Amino acid sequence: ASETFEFQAEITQLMSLIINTVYSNKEIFLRELISNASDALDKIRYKSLSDPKQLETEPDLFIRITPKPEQKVLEIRDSGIGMTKAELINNLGTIAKSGTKAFMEALSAGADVSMIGQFGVGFYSLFLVADRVQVISKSNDDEQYIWESNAGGSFTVTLDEVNERIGRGTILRLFLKDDQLEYLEEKRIKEVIKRHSEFVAYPIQLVVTKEVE
């Protein structure tokens, strides 16, 4: 059984603005999600300084990008600290985020949408290219859960009994908009990554499915 929660009003407002904006540089979403993945990895690494056992659930620290053409899905995975059920609810929707309103006010004044990360709400930039998202996460402190949103005022959280087991970490499964399928292409993904992420300390793995000649 899934549980439904209401987003903090300002977040709903932000998602509506982002999912509908005709901003030209939509590729910035990848930079923001890679940045968030890197931060999550930094967190588990730092925590492991005094609790080495924390890494055992998934010894490899990585960021992985997996296009799923048939499903028109793009997944961004990391083996970071992950989020418990409580953290998914709090961090992604119910708790008011400091820069949410501030960012929208900046946008109204003319700020570039690319500044979203500096306001601490870069996660929501995913709606530039997707109309739905499932955040699948596994924290060492809880079971695996699925947080889902379609930019609407409510989101759901469900105990995960349908996706692959992740040792520890988070998967952002983006359901791409019909006109943003270019982000399923290896060449396109590679150029975007190489452009806004040169100083990422973790390996960025691209999973490519090729037909054997």
Side-chain angles (χ1 to χ4, degrees), residues 1-52 54-69 71-94 96-100 102-186 188-209 211-212:
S2 64
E3 278 173 278
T4 302
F5 305 79
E6 182 177 58
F7 272 106
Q8 200 280 319
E10 287 68 9
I11 303 181
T12 299
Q13 288 171 35
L14 179 60
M15 294 188 291
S16 183
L17 178 50
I18 298 298
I19 198 171
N20 291 301
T21 187
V22 295
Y23 179 67
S24 66
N25 313 134
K26 296 179 176 238
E27 70 184 54
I28 63 172
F29 82 96
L30 195 52
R31 177 186 193 177
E32 295 309 321
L33 302 187
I34 287 177
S35 181
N36 284 6
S38 182
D39 294 339
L41 283 157
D42 286 347
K43 298 298 193 249
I44 191 62
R45 277 205 302 133
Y46 189 96
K47 186 171 196 167
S48 73
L49 290 177
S50 294
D51 194 344
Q54 294 285 328
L55 294 171
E56 285 178 44
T57 43
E58 174 52 83
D60 294 327
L61 301 177
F62 59 90
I63 296 177
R64 182 177 301 156
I65 309 300
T66 308
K68 290 183 172 180
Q71 304 168 56
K72 292 188 295 182
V73 156
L74 178 65
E75 293 182 357
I76 299 83
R77 175 180 182 180
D78 65 69
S79 47
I81 188 167
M83 292 175 276
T84 64
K85 179 185 182 186
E87 297 178 313
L88 287 166
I89 295 169
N90 181 54
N91 295 6
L92 303 179
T94 63
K97 300 171 170 60
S98 176
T100 309
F103 179 58
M104 293 189 283
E105 281 166 40
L107 286 179
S108 295
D112 194 274
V113 177
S114 65
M115 282 192 83
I116 192 169
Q118 295 178 67
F119 285 83
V121 291
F123 166 78
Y124 301 100
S125 67
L126 66 85
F127 286 113
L128 289 169
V129 302
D131 45 43
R132 178 188 170 199
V133 57
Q134 281 177 1
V135 172
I136 304 160
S137 196
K138 177 66 177 66
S139 161
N140 288 338
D141 300 344
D142 206 351
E143 298 297 306
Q144 189 165 307
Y145 280 87
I146 306 159
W147 175 98
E148 182 163 33
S149 171
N150 59 4
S154 68
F155 64 86
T156 63
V157 175
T158 312
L159 180 63
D160 194 335
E161 299 189 306
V162 299
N163 299 302
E164 66 179 309
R165 296 301 91 173
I166 58 175
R168 182 197 62 249
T170 303
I171 294 174
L172 262 62
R173 177 179 289 159
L174 312 184
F175 293 80
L176 304 176
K177 293 172 173 179
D178 290 321
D179 69 311
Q180 302 301 315
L181 303 183
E182 69 193 67
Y183 295 111
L184 293 172
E185 295 159 42
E186 165 180 30
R188 178 56 171 155
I189 297 172
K190 282 192 173 186
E191 62 155 343
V192 174
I193 296 175
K194 295 185 178 62
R195 181 157 42 199
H196 304 281
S197 301
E198 155 179 42
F199 297 106
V200 177
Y202 309 98
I204 299 177
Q205 315 171 328
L206 179 59
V207 179
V208 183
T209 302
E211 194 179 310
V212 178

